[PDB]
Symmetry: C7
Subunit: 30 residues, 7 copies
Amino acid sequence: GEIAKALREIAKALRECAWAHREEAKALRG
Amino acid sequence: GEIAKALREIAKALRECAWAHREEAKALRG
Amino acid sequence: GEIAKALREIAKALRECAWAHREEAKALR
Amino acid sequence: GEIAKALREIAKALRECAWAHREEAKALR
Amino acid sequence: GEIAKALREIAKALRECAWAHREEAKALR
Amino acid sequence: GEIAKALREIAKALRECAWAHREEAKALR
Amino acid sequence: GEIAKALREIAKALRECAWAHREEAKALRG
């Protein structure tokens, strides 16, 4: 369904955000 | 659908958020 | 619809967040 | 509707989030 | 309804996040 | 219902996020 | 259901964000 697909897009975008936050943590402690 | 379109807009906005965080992680290094 | 409008308000608020996060990165460099 | 109203509550909270992030950006300078 | 109640819990959690971001900004000053 | 349960999971994950942001704030100062 | 499953994927991604933030906090302290 279109609605379920769009919710999965939201999840994927948040997994992007998480990756970016993990990079901030690594850049900080370095 | 209007609801699905709006959910995709939320996703797009979160992808903008992730890009911003990736830039923060880059800035934090140098 | 009222639900779709509210979801668009959520999207807009997140675009505000992204602009702010961008300004944080600029302030860092 | 109560669902639309709750979704608007979520957007309002995210606009709070953005305001605070804009304050972080100002503080980093 | 259960769905509206859960959405409000989501907003409540984001207000917590906003309060934490205001605190981070405060620490940065 | 499963949708309400999943929304409550999102709320709980955001409360996790808020706790972590509070830990960042603390670590800052 | 597909919608419920997608919503749980959003929650999973946010728990990923939380883990990353807990790592950022550990890095700020050292």
